[PDB]
């Protein structure tokens, strides 16, 4: 079919690689492709260089490192629950200073996780994503003192876990104070430690009259750098002996030590640019030729005094400015934890160096790799920034990798978070999407990288612009930080151009974010595209300019939740971004070079290229993702087909011919229907189920272990006590359900038997079994069964055993068995549907086709959406989408309508006219005139002022059709809807929230250990929480017995719940409640606090709730 | 008043601070055990240091550590650094922690509870329903009313008895 695209704006550059933020970061951190001698001082190499050399006389030094090949490929790691990783070797040499003896060896430090091609990780078989962090960039800042106006705070901030924040403040008593580790002390003391003479400080700070006088203290200058140093040491360390070398050690470690104190490279640069100086190292001072020399302190003090005085060219800082907020990507975070683990390894090294034999010590004996391994593993497992990858659809992964978080280690906590940072700063333009953020507690804290946005080597987000010289717009593209962007007048991307020249007398631009109308002579730069303002998700919403931001947020977020459909289709109205997303996400398989297709299979595509070489591509088939969505690739080519470079070989999940397919294109009518669409509920046609629209494959994995116990071994077998052959029907010889079998709740996936503990067979049970002639067995049925509400076809079985080749399990485990079950999910009532404009709803009704509103030609609508959802929501994009959707229905074409450079009403009207001719003229030729019902509806619409009086029925019907409205017949009556109804094609997705996953119920089930209350959650077969507020509801109703049941009979009252169940199965009314067990737990826990809690009667006599069991 | 000093520190019943074998045969246990173990180790070492006639600095240190141990047991992190398990920054959960807070005994297990005969699901509009009615999915009802259903199954020929009915609904 034909794809017609709108808009005049020609994008100069394409979108940058969208996963580059992960990929280039980690690649930069590892430097695996760089030969060791050519490596830079950045990355894990940096950590090695900071840790080593290790001294104190033995000395352990670092030569170089290397990363080996991964012991296992990614797939094998996924199946075996391994981690995709490379062995890390480090060449070290021990040198005894006195002896001169040098022992050199390459030691094995364990493994490091490798990033996959798509920018994710495989940790213990599960795919994870390390999310970029946003934080305050290190440097020197000047902020208004909130209490006293006219006074300011100078804060010196290093990298996280790189040493203390230092504050500088002019006190009301006139003296300048320094704050370190919450210690306020006169700065002049440290100034003296740096070896500053009063004359130098006087000539330097003299320009500011009142302040430098407050700086002057003669008791300090009467001292010496040594005496001042020891004085400061006594100030920072009460009780600690003021030894000279110890004071030098402490102050050096606090300020001048590069290993203890680190401003980033960015902190270095920003400090330099702000204070107008040049930094030697990344510290605030140095230890040179035996004494200390100042770097940052004096320039900071100078600037602070200058700002306080009012001296021009001195301003406070906007800490929310994106020039002052940087990003820590995967490489930096991983490198950080690497540095920590390395430090621990070093501590161990010094230990062994002191303790070990002096004659023979190898680096292998000195180095224990364990702490480092632990640090890395901990980072990739228990870190908040290490998240379970969202694979629901390819766009979910792509978007997840592009996420930015203000939370995590060294970041904000949601308590400390408050407006000023969840705000949307003007500097977010082109950098951080203003639209896509969570609605709830994380709002503004979790954000998304803009489409054209890039993170520089310093960690600042940069957006592209275009050089404009003399009103001529070049193709030269410049990526600036926010600070650089602030220096220019930047024209909007929609400013009218003839050729490369701007033609308008007046152009709309930004100067430091401020909108301004300027002449073309004033334009320095121009935007690349409206696309650059938003995220990859937001860029997928057509007619975005017609949607309120609040619903754009919802559409964005919800696209992430779209489930891959077997029949999945690209939107009828696209934004033009649909293919790049598929490509960058590595969802689809593409042709490497120009060539010819040799072989096409469900499992394989073999291509012969220009090189004459035969390259075979295996297709991933019905693989289970993290969210249980089926990820499978289907061949889109055929045998003998010629393919050029970058051609599509195969469609992955949610991809139709290389275009992102997140849902279906359905025919909607926008009308109320019998209350079934009330309050956002949605009505759909059974025709959608008939043709398998919104049907999705989901695969669930079940797992069981058979282990060695002290009562005898558990074992996986087909022999299950007290079970018929009907139950073992689908079980194979070994006891595992056979591939292809259909399983329902209660069915056995894997047979397992376990020996019984002392369960001293109830001499009750002894009797029983003896009577029944059947001897009481020693084993019981532990088999893994299909949980309630689940089931499907078994598509896989994995069996690993101890004693099997290449297989070693965790200690005590004899064998592990997994069973993969696939299910085909049709759309059903309660499933969540949504469009890209933020219109979401749960399917409340599925009508048979004959009940559906239909067009006069007999065509029933697919979906009925309530118009009441439009006005308060203010997302009109869906309406336009519908209108155009109508046109493309009858013209049989799809559209690209770029955001903010769109399809416009008149164009849609033209298309609707052509479409109308297609929709009507056909009828007129078919020998049918205008219908009576059509006449009535035309009269009605004529009263509404929709059509002009005096025109022919055809003319009026066309007048309506241009408004996107058509006559519609009630399927139940045959009489038409009194008004003409808006009908057209809309792109609707089936979200990951499905009632099949959420429906849960329990009578009784497992209880908690200590509290004896029901467990929570569906997976545990748990009870719903009746919380304080539910209790308040029952209290407010004055329903005492319902409440008391909630508190006792239905939860933690043991005797009560038992007696209640028995009473109910007997048919008796439920017995009176007893003491809830958790109250006894409270009493006994208060007793453990040495408080005596006594239940008393009206006689003030003790009452025993433990019934003598607790009393001697 | 002197009862505000502890000569004999009470010990919670073990079931309230369980040592339990989880599914895989591995053990999981309450922090209170580790707190109590610190306490008992320090106390015993104190008695042995006393009996052996130790110098005053040592006994002083031991007593201080004993008081801090008791503190950690009753309210952890109340005075001084919170006691943590080896290789973790996580504070151990003491009796005070157990009692108070949103996760505390009162608010979590006392003023509110998880309950039986309860369920949840997605909601859908009811337009055909009368005001006093709600649509309830069949299976949810089968589970929620389950004992009643067993009873009624026995009242008819549907099952020989309750247990047969339940095994039938399995």
């Amino acid at each position: 079919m034909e794809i017609k695209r709108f808009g005049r704006i020609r994008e100069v550059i394409p979108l940058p690689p969208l996963t580059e933020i992960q990929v280039e970061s980690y690649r930069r951190a590892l430097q695996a492709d760089v030969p060791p001698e050519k490596r830079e001082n950045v990355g894990i190499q940096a950590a090695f260089r900071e840790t080593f050399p290790i001294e104190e006389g033995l000395v352990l030094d670092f030569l170089e490192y290397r990363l080996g090949e991964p012991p296992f490929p990614q797939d094998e790691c996924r199946e075996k629950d391994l981690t995709y990783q490379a062995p890390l070797y480090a060449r070290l040499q021990l040198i005894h200073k006195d002896t001169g003896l040098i022992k050199e060896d390459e030691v094995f430090l364990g493994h490091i996780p490798l990033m996959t091609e798509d920018g994710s990780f495989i940790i213990n078989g599960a795919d994870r994503v390390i999310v970029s962090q946003i934080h305050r960039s290190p440097g020197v800042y000047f902020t208004p003192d909130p209490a006293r106006p006219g006074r300011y705070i100078a804060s010196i901030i290093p990298l996280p876990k790189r040493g203390p924040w230092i504050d500088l403040e002019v006190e009301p008593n006139g003296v300048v104070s320094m704050k370190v580790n919450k210690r306020k002390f006169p700065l002049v003391l440290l100034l003296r430690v740096l070896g500053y003479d009063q004359e130098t400080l006087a000539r330097e700070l003299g320009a500011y009259g009142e302040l430098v006088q407050g700086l002057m203290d003669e008791s300090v200058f009467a001292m010496r750098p040594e005496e001042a140093l020891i004085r400061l040491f006594t100030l920072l360390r009460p009780g600690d002996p003021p030894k000279r070398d110890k004071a030098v050690a402490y102050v050096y470690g606090l300020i001048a030590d590069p290993r203890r104190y680190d401003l980033g490279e960015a902190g270095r640069y920003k400090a330099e640019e702000k204070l107008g100086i040049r930094l030697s190292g990344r510290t605030l001072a140095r230890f040179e030729d035996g004494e200390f020399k100042d770097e940052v302190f004096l320039p900071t003090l100078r600037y602070l005094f200058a700002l306080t005085a009012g001296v021009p060219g001195h301003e406070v800082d906007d800490i929310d400015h994106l020039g002052n907020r940087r990003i820590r990507t995967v490489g930096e975070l991983m490198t950080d934890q690497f540095r920590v683990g390395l430090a621990r390894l070093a501590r161990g090294v010094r230990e062994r160096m002191l303790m070990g034999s002096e004659d023979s010590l190898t680096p292998a004996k000195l180095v224990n790799s364990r702490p480092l391994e632990a640090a890395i593993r901990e980072f990739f497992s228990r870190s908040q920034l290490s998240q379970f990858k969202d694979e629901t659809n390819p766009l979910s992964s792509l978007r997840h990798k592009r996420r930015i978080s203000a939370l995590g280690p060294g970041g904000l906590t949601r308590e400390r978070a408050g407006f000023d940072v969840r705000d949307v700063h003007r500097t977010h333009y082109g950098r951080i999407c203003p639209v896509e953020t969570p609605e709830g507690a994380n709002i503004g804290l979790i954000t998304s990288l803009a489409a054209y946005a890039r993170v520089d080597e310093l960690g600042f987000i940069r957006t592209p612009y275009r050089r404009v010289v003399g009103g001529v717009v070049t193709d030269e593209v410049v990526y600036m930080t926010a600070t650089e962007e602030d220096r220019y007048t930047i024209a909007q991307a929609n400013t009218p151009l003839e050729g490369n020249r701007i033609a308008a007398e007046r152009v709309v631009a930004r100067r430091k974010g401020e909108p301004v109308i300027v002449s073309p002579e004033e334009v320095e730069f121009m935007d690349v595209s409206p696309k650059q303002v938003f995220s990859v998700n937001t860029n997928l919403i057509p007619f975005l300019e017609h949607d309120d931001a609040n619903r754009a947020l919802m559409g964005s977020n919800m696209q992430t939740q779209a489930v891959p459909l077997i029949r999945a289709q690209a939107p009828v109205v696209m934004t033009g971004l649909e293919e790049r997303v598929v490509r960058d996400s590595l969802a689809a398989l593409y042709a490497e070079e120009d060539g010819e297709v040799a072989k096409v299979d469900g499992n394989r595509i073999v291509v012969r290229y220009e090189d004459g070489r035969l390259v075979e591509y295996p297709l991933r088939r019905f693989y289970r993702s993290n969210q249980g969505t089926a990820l499978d690739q289907r061949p889109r080519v055929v045998v003998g087909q010629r393919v050029r470079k970058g051609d599509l070989l195969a469609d992955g999940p949610a991809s139709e011919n290389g275009f992102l397919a997140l849902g279906q294109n359905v025919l909607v009518a926008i009308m109320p229907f019998d209350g079934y669409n009330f309050e956002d509920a949605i009505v759909i046609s059974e025709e959608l189920l008939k043709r398998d629209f919104y049907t999705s494959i989901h695969i669930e994995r079940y797992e069981i272990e058979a282990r060695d116990t002290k009562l005898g071994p558990e074992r996986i077998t087909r022999d299950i006590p007290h079970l018929s052959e009907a139950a073992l029907r689908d079980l194979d010889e070994e006891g595992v359900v056979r591939i292809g079998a259909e399983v329902k709740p209660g069915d056995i996936l894997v047979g397992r038997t376990s020996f019984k503990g002392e369960s001293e067979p109830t001499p009750e049970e002894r009797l029983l079994r003896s009577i029944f002639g059947e001897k009481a067995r020693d084993v019981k049925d532990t088999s893994l069964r299909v949980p309630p509400g689940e089931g499907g076809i078994v598509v896989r079985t994995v069996r690993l055993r101890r004693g099997d080749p290449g297989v070693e399990l965790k200690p005590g485990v004899r064998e592990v068995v997994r069973v993969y079950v696939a299910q085909k999910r049709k759309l059903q009532v309660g499933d969540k549907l949504a469009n890209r404009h933020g219109n979401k709803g749960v399917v409340a009704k599925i009508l048979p086709v004959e009940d559906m509103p239909h067009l006069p030609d007999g065509t029933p609508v697919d979906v009925i959406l309530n118009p009441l959802g439009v006005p308060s929501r203010m997302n009109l994009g869906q309406i336009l989408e519908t209108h155009l959707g109508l046109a493309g229905y009858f013209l049989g074409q799809r559209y690209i309508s770029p955001i903010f450079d769109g399809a416009k009403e008149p164009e849609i009207k033209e298309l609707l006219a052509q479409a109308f001719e297609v929709y009507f003229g056909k009828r007129k030729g078919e020998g049918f005139g205008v219908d009576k019902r059509e006449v009535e509806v035309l009269r009605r619409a004529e009263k509404l002022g929709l059509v002009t009086p005096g025109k022919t029925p055809e003319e009026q019907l066309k007048e309506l059709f241009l408004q996107g409205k058509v006559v519609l017949y009630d399927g139940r009556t045959g009489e038409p809807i009194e008004g003409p109804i808006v009908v057209g094609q809309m792109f609707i997705m089936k979200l990951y929230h499905m009632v099949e996953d959420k429906m849960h119920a329990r009578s009784t089930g497992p209880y908690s250990l200590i509290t004896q209350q029901p467990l929570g959650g569906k997976a545990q077969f748990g009870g719903q929480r009746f919380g304080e507020m539910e209790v308040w509801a029952l209290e407010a109703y004055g329903a005492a017995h319902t409440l008391q049941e909630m508190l006792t009979l239905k939860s933690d009252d043991i005797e009560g719940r038992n007696a209640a169940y028995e009473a109910i199965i007997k048919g008796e009314d439920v017995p009176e409640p007893s003491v809830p067990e958790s109250f006894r737990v409270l009493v006994k826990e208060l007793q453990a606090l040495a408080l005596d809690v006594q239940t008393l009667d009206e006689k003030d006599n003790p009452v025993d709730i433990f019934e003598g069991l607790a009393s001697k | 008043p002197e009862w505000m000093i502890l000569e004999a520190v009470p010990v919670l019943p073990p079931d309230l601070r369980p040592m339990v074998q989880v599914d895989g045969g591995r053990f999981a246990t309450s922090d209170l055990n580790d707190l109590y173990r610190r306490l008992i180790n320090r106390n015993n070492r104190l008695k042995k240091l006393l009996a052996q006639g130790a110098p005053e600095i040592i006994i002083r240190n031991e007593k201080r550590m004993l008081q801090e141990a008791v503190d950690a047991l009753l309210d952890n992190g109340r005075r001084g650094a919170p006691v943590t398990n080896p290789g973790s920054d996580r504070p151990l959960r003491s009796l005070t922690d157990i009692l108070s807070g949103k996760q505390g005994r009162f608010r979590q297990n006392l003023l509110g509870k998880r309950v039986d005969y309860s369920g949840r699901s997605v909601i859908v509009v009811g337009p055909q329903l009368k005001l006093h009615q709600c649509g309830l999915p069949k299976r949810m009802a089968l589970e929620l009313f389950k004992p009643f259903l067993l009873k009624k199954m026995e009242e008819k020929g549907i099952a020989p008895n309750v247990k047969a009915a339940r095994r039938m609904l399995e």
């Binding site: 009780g239 600690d240 | 240190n61 201080r64 550590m65 801090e68 001084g80």
Partner: peptide
Amino acid sequence: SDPVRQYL
């Protein structure tokens, strides 16, 4: 305040 410091 700090028990180790005190003891030292």
